[PDB]
Amino acid sequence: QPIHWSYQINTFKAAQSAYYGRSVQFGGKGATKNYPINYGRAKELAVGSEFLTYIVSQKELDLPVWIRLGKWSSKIRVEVEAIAP
RNA sequence: ACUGAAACGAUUGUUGUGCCCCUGGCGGUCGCUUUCAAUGCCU
Numbered sequence A: 001q002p003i004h005w006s007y008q009i010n011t012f013k014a015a016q017s018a019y020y021g022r023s024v025q026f027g028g029k030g031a032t033k034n035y036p037i038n039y040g041r042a043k044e045l046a047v048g049s050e051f052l053t054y055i056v057s058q059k060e061l062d063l064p065v066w067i068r069l070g071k072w073s074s075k076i077r078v079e080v081e082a083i084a085p
Numbered sequence B: 001a002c003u004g005a006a007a008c009g010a011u012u013g014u015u016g017u018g019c020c021c022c023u024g025g026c027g028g029u030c031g032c033u034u035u036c037a038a039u040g041c042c043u
Helices: none
Strands: A002-004 A007-013 A039-045 A066-069 A074-077
Touching: none
Parallel strands: none
Antiparallel strands: A007 A039, A066 A074
């Protein structure tokens, strides 16, 4: 559940590793296969955000206080409390 | 296969080109090197 959230729209690119770069149309010659050629804009969930989840288990659980999520393996602080009986 | 695996908004570019701290201006004005003195004493 999102408790507090914001979005950033940030561009991402393909690198020109060679000294010479041609902008090629996607599906053109030398570009005929589905790969991230050219550029795109990602609407990311931003640092200014907080989400709430619940884990239910039948045994005391050594939950990691850091996790990674998504397309770019991005860090989340997990702060966790066991809800007492 | 975490709505997954990899993922450069990049490449190039001179805040540039011209420009007299310039013009005018008397270190000027006033001012006695002055005041006193035996070529002297004797033949």
